[PDB]
Amino acid sequence: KGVYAHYMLKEIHEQPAVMRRIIQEYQDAEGNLKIDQDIINDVKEADRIYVIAAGTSYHAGLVGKEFLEKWAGVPTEVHVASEFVYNMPLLSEKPLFVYISQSGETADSRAVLVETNKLGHKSLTITNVAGSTLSREADHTLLLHAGPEIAVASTKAYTAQIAVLSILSQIVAKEHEADIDLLRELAKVTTAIEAIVDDAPIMEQIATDFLETTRNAFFIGRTIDYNVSLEGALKLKEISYIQAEGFAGGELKHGTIALIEDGTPVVALATQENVNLSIRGNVKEVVARGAHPCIISMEGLEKEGDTYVIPHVHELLTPLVSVVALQLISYYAALHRDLDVDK
Amino acid sequence: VYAHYMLKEIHEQPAVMRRIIQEYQDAEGNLKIDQDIINDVKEADRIYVIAAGTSYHAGLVGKEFLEKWAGVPTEVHVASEFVYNMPLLSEKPLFVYISQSGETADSRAVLVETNKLGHKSLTITNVAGSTLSREADHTLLLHAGPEIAVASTKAYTAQIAVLSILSQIVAKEHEADIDLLRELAKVTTAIEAIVDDAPIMEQIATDFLETTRNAFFIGRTIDYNVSLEGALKLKEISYIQAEGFAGGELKHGTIALIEDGTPVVALATQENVNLSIRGNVKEVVARGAHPCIISMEGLEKEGDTYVIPHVHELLTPLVSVVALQLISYYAALHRD
């Protein structure tokens, strides 16, 4: 029984509704971006931000770092909590710690927060669960409004985390400002996500064409796209057990290029103008060695032969759209191997 | 005969270490680097290490010395990403370019940009007179001799040794309570002990890596960094799809990839996470993994596959990596 075969598929379809909830929750009656000013005051006074997370939340943090530096103008580092807690590095004078955690209870993040609290530094938690430990023990909380995630592989939590980071960063920019109307840009993103979801059949076909028999897969991108590559590789591993790995395009030369054989699927993201030719060059190099290339590009950057072309959205927001293609391709790869998916 | 130059270069590492120890000391037996270099490093507010591949891995190891000994916050960046997406910089940044050849394209491109911006630079290279040396404010040489093998080995250990020396000298400008030259001699002797145990490294290869299409190298903190370099070595010479992971992150999909017989090479050289990484090993063993635990004297437990000699906690990479290089070499030999 049930409209969707799996919770994960339902949750992917819910992403546009999550974006709409975020857009409504983080604006005022006049339609301006709105976050509690005390949060903004601490964020804008920090000399450095340390994002503390793991897994999919760590990957969202990578995307968010771009907004925090390029819009908010605050130097930002992203760390794996299990590492940070056992080897805390030298800290800046006025650091702010941002704990990204869907549940709000992630153990290693909680241990880090105990320590940064002991040290007297300020903290912000981004979470889906109000009144979770990470919320209660941090100075400030931003809520995701994603609703409960039942599937083990996160989908809507990732896009919600990024969206919230973008809003926080633009409001801080204003205090000191990206020449964009972010709410308008996020509505564009919503509509783009819908377009990908409505192209589910094409995503199923891509899975069939590229991922039916392989034991491995390589997800490659540069810059903003390298971050998303990591997440697509995680999704495909989590649910299909394909040994998927994400690489920066310019790093393939070190060991990985050797691994290419005739038929090896390489999923390449090309959503960034400055590295469009570069990442396509990397694809030509893996193709010469036998790879089967699945290029996912963006309107304005696409070339003959690309496998799929996502709608045009703002250069730093492309992860919100490209990831949905990767989620659905991963879902269908798993489905075709008759796996549980939701776990 | 098989991969002649890799095995040759592995065996050169003691000699390289002894050359570095000689070149970086004076006739008084004190550490010696040019004072201008020391002044620039000691005055920097942050160091940005710019590297790729094995030198990026060496950078990760060196960050620990630069922070913990020299007291300067340090970031390590992949050059090909940095050059197309340069991040926000500190007020007094120093750039450290690690490159064996001194000609690495992406690193060169970043140096051009940092020089345009007027920031200080230091190059760590094996080739004097290379572009990265000529265009940087300062150069430190590696004394490693020529590199011919496809899979790099002696570069990594030379780079870490020089990073340790630079860091301790800076620390003294204001100093870790160790005798670094003495600790590097201990490291040299430990490396010799591993190389003398080549037959054991070959057996480890037979026992774990003969048939697999993949391998997982895991570690925490200092050992996570070395796990990345061991995965790279195995991939480069054997073509097995090796990956390195932090022990505490396996719960994210990667544990999904464990089957009966999957080899997991686990490093345990760090006191504070010894119990933690051993817990992570249990977790993968529960799912079928075949565990190769490489630990260090003082931290070993019954059942460990190999125990390396005791050296300083931050220097352990210099020794542990040699085990991984040799294991990788022999896996490749056997499979060919």
Side-chain angles (χ1 to χ4, degrees):
Chain A
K1 302 214 295 255
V3 166
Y4 299 94
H6 296 92
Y7 290 121
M8 198 186 166
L9 185 62
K10 182 171 166 58
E11 287 166 7
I12 289 169
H13 283 73
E14 191 179 6
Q15 289 177 288
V18 175
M19 300 290 103
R20 278 184 294 264
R21 285 198 292 275
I22 292 168
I23 291 164
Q24 291 304 301
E25 289 290 342
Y26 287 101
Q27 74 182 85
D28 63 24
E30 300 188 316
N32 296 139
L33 302 169
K34 182 50 172 193
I35 287 174
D36 288 358
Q37 189 65 35
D38 53 356
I39 298 181
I40 300 306
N41 290 345
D42 284 346
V43 177
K44 74 189 213 308
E45 290 175 304
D47 57 8
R48 188 165 281 265
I49 292 170
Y50 300 79
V51 178
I52 307 299
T56 292
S57 58
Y58 167 85
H59 294 154
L62 296 174
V63 175
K65 163 168 157 58
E66 305 294 320
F67 317 127
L68 286 164
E69 292 212 349
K70 294 167 169 174
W71 299 350
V74 189
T76 299
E77 304 176 20
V78 185
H79 294 261
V80 176
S82 65
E83 290 291 301
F84 198 88
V85 71
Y86 286 105
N87 188 25
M88 198 171 296
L90 289 177
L91 302 176
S92 68
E93 276 293 323
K94 301 158 204 213
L96 173 80
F97 292 89
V98 175
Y99 300 85
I100 304 178
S101 168
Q102 175 71 191
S103 74
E105 298 296 345
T106 316
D108 295 326
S109 292
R110 286 188 300 101
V112 177
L113 175 55
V114 173
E115 285 315 303
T116 64
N117 279 342
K118 231 166 281 203
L119 297 172
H121 303 304
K122 291 167 185 318
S123 48
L124 167 64
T125 290
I126 299 170
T127 182
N128 197 41
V129 178
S132 60
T133 307
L134 290 168
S135 172
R136 305 187 327 257
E137 295 195 356
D139 292 278
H140 308 297
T141 295
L142 295 164
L143 298 168
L144 294 169
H145 303 283
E149 232 179 26
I150 308 165
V152 59
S154 180
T155 55
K156 64 179 182 177
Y158 177 83
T159 52
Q161 294 160 357
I162 289 159
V164 167
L165 291 159
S166 76
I167 287 161
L168 173 61
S169 303
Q170 177 72 331
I171 293 177
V172 168
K174 277 218 186 46
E175 297 281 306
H176 298 131
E177 182 187 6
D179 187 32
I180 52 165
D181 174 344
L182 174 64
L183 289 172
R184 182 174 301 262
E185 296 299 337
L186 290 174
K188 207 181 300 190
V189 162
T190 306
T191 302
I193 293 166
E194 292 174 337
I196 309 303
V197 173
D198 288 351
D199 276 347
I202 294 162
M203 304 303 119
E204 179 156 31
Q205 189 65 58
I206 292 169
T208 293
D209 294 350
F210 289 86
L211 296 179
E212 191 75 6
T213 58
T214 197
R215 60 151 227 102
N216 68 0
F218 303 120
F219 288 74
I220 68 175
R222 285 174 173 256
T223 72
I224 281 55
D225 296 321
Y226 163 63
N227 293 334
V228 190
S229 293
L230 294 175
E231 179 69 4
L234 178 59
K235 290 298 95 128
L236 184 59
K237 268 196 287 204
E238 261 175 354
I239 66 170
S240 76
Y241 326 139
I242 290 166
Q243 185 180 355
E245 273 196 81
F247 295 106
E251 293 313 285
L252 289 178
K253 298 147 156 174
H254 313 281
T256 83
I257 267 268
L259 297 191
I260 301 296
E261 318 162 73
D262 270 54
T264 302
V266 172
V267 177
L269 281 174
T271 81
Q272 299 299 113
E273 164 64 21
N274 70 325
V275 286
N276 191 35
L277 298 178
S278 292
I279 188 67
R280 293 175 182 281
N282 299 136
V283 170
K284 300 188 176 228
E285 293 161 352
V286 294
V287 168
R289 287 158 167 102
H292 191 194
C294 169
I295 301 168
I296 300 162
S297 191
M298 182 163 81
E299 290 171 349
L301 303 181
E302 76 283 7
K303 302 289 189 190
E304 292 308 316
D306 293 350
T307 305
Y308 191 75
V309 182
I310 74 173
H312 185 273
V313 297
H314 185 283
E315 63 189 324
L316 303 183
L317 298 180
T318 77
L320 292 169
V321 181
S322 68
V323 82
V324 181
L326 311 182
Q327 296 163 349
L328 285 164
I329 293 161
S330 298
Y331 175 78
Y332 287 118
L335 191 69
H336 300 157
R337 295 170 185 231
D338 301 299
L339 303 167
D340 190 89
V341 185
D342 289 333
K343 284 156 140 300
Chain B
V1 185
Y2 179 73
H4 161 83
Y5 288 104
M6 190 184 183
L7 191 59
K8 174 190 177 285
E9 292 170 14
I10 286 166
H11 283 77
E12 288 168 342
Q13 291 169 288
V16 173
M17 300 291 102
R18 291 184 167 101
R19 289 199 294 275
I20 289 167
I21 286 164
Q22 289 309 303
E23 297 285 345
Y24 282 93
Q25 76 179 269
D26 62 24
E28 303 189 74
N30 292 330
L31 296 189
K32 197 49 167 43
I33 284 178
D34 288 348
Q35 186 67 39
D36 46 357
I37 301 183
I38 295 174
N39 285 352
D40 282 345
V41 180
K42 87 155 171 272
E43 298 171 2
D45 63 0
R46 184 164 285 265
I47 299 172
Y48 296 79
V49 175
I50 303 303
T54 184
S55 65
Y56 166 87
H57 301 151
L60 291 175
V61 175
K63 166 172 182 158
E64 308 289 325
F65 319 131
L66 288 163
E67 294 208 347
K68 291 174 172 162
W69 299 349
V72 57
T74 299
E75 301 171 27
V76 187
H77 290 263
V78 177
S80 63
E81 289 288 303
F82 200 89
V83 75
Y84 280 111
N85 187 18
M86 192 169 330
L88 292 180
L89 303 179
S90 71
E91 282 221 34
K92 290 204 57 149
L94 165 81
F95 293 86
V96 176
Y97 297 87
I98 309 181
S99 166
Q100 199 70 4
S101 69
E103 300 296 354
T104 308
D106 285 321
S107 292
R108 285 190 293 108
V110 175
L111 177 58
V112 162
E113 295 309 314
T114 67
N115 283 344
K116 285 174 192 165
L117 293 166
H119 306 305
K120 296 281 179 206
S121 49
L122 173 59
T123 288
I124 302 175
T125 185
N126 203 41
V127 184
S130 63
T131 308
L132 286 170
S133 176
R134 299 193 311 277
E135 294 189 5
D137 295 294
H138 312 301
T139 300
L140 297 172
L141 298 166
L142 294 168
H143 304 288
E147 176 193 289
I148 301 165
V150 70
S152 182
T153 55
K154 63 185 178 170
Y156 178 75
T157 47
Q159 292 164 4
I160 293 168
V162 170
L163 284 159
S164 77
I165 289 162
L166 169 66
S167 301
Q168 180 64 335
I169 293 177
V170 174
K172 297 196 115 179
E173 289 293 283
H174 335 96
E175 162 217 292
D177 58 51
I178 66 156
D179 181 331
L180 179 61
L181 292 171
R182 173 191 329 288
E183 298 288 350
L184 294 169
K186 195 183 299 181
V187 162
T188 304
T189 301
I191 291 172
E192 288 176 316
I194 301 313
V195 172
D196 187 46
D197 282 342
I200 296 176
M201 308 301 118
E202 185 166 12
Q203 187 67 54
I204 293 167
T206 295
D207 289 345
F208 291 85
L209 297 180
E210 184 79 2
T211 62
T212 194
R213 7 71 266 297
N214 66 8
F216 300 101
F217 288 75
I218 68 173
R220 287 183 172 247
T221 72
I222 281 59
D223 296 318
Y224 165 54
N225 288 336
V226 186
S227 298
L228 296 173
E229 178 70 357
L232 176 61
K233 301 305 91 156
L234 184 58
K235 286 157 54 156
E236 282 188 305
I237 191 65
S238 74
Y239 316 134
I240 286 171
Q241 186 183 357
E243 298 187 71
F245 293 107
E249 282 288 272
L250 299 169
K251 50 186 137 181
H252 309 294
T254 302
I255 276 200
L257 303 182
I258 301 292
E259 309 172 313
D260 197 287
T262 299
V264 175
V265 176
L267 275 180
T269 75
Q270 300 299 116
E271 165 62 25
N272 72 322
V273 287
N274 195 28
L275 291 177
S276 293
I277 192 64
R278 294 174 181 278
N280 301 133
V281 174
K282 301 204 182 338
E283 288 161 354
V284 302
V285 164
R287 298 317 220 301
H290 188 201
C292 176
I293 300 162
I294 300 170
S295 66
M296 177 168 83
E297 299 167 336
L299 306 182
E300 83 283 2
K301 305 289 168 170
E302 197 282 332
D304 288 351
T305 297
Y306 191 75
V307 181
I308 72 178
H310 181 84
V311 301
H312 188 280
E313 62 190 312
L314 298 184
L315 298 181
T316 78
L318 295 171
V319 177
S320 65
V321 79
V322 181
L324 307 188
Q325 296 162 166
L326 283 160
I327 291 164
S328 296
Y329 173 85
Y330 286 115
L333 188 159
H334 294 160
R335 297 162 59 102
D336 186 78

